[PDB]
Design a protein around this ligand. Sequence first.
Ligand SMILES: [Mn+2]
Ligand SMILES: [Mn+2]
Length: 230
Amino acid sequence: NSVSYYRSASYSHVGMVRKVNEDASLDAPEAGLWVVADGMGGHAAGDFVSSLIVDTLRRIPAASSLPAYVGALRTGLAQVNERVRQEAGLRGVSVMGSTLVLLAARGNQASCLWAGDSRLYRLRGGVLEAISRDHSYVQELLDNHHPRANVVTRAVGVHEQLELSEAALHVLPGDSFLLCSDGLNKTADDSELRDVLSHSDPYAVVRSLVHLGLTRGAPDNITALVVRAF
Ligand SMILES: [Mn+2]
Ligand SMILES: [Mn+2]
């Protein structure tokens, strides 16, 4: 019952309103690493931060021990946070940051690190389950389609100390995972995500998710990254 192999695919689209894609992704199954980052601040700001995230995380050496790897990912994100803070302060801009959601896998164990309203879902036995929980003003109100949905309470470059949320996962053969920016779940509810994810091919699945989003007016940059365990 141990997990042998991870298949993955990613697809992003600027959408139907924005003309600059500030979404970024890293599809590195060769390092057991999958990342989606939703940049904010417009061109030369949001995409700057999201691309810096994916490039910094890509260069981290793939340590065999998942907990050590996760420690290294955390440190890399802290360094990205500090660099973005320095740059934003220098330019004097109000908005310069990016959400993050990553999944790192080693055999039968995986870890999710996230900050923002980019999500990780797990599909197991045809049942979809939200692993991450939005760092959003709305989510805090719900924990106690809302107009306060544009307020992200944690993301890279927002605060001095970046506080990442973490969730550990036991992976079974046949498990599926979806990393996405809010542009997808904003245009398809969780039951439709479960429907589209219930297919064998991650490449067709991510393209079908983005297509459904585009079909419903794609108000935001829409990115989907699907991982399947064997
Ligand atoms: Mn964005
Ligand atoms: Mn977004």
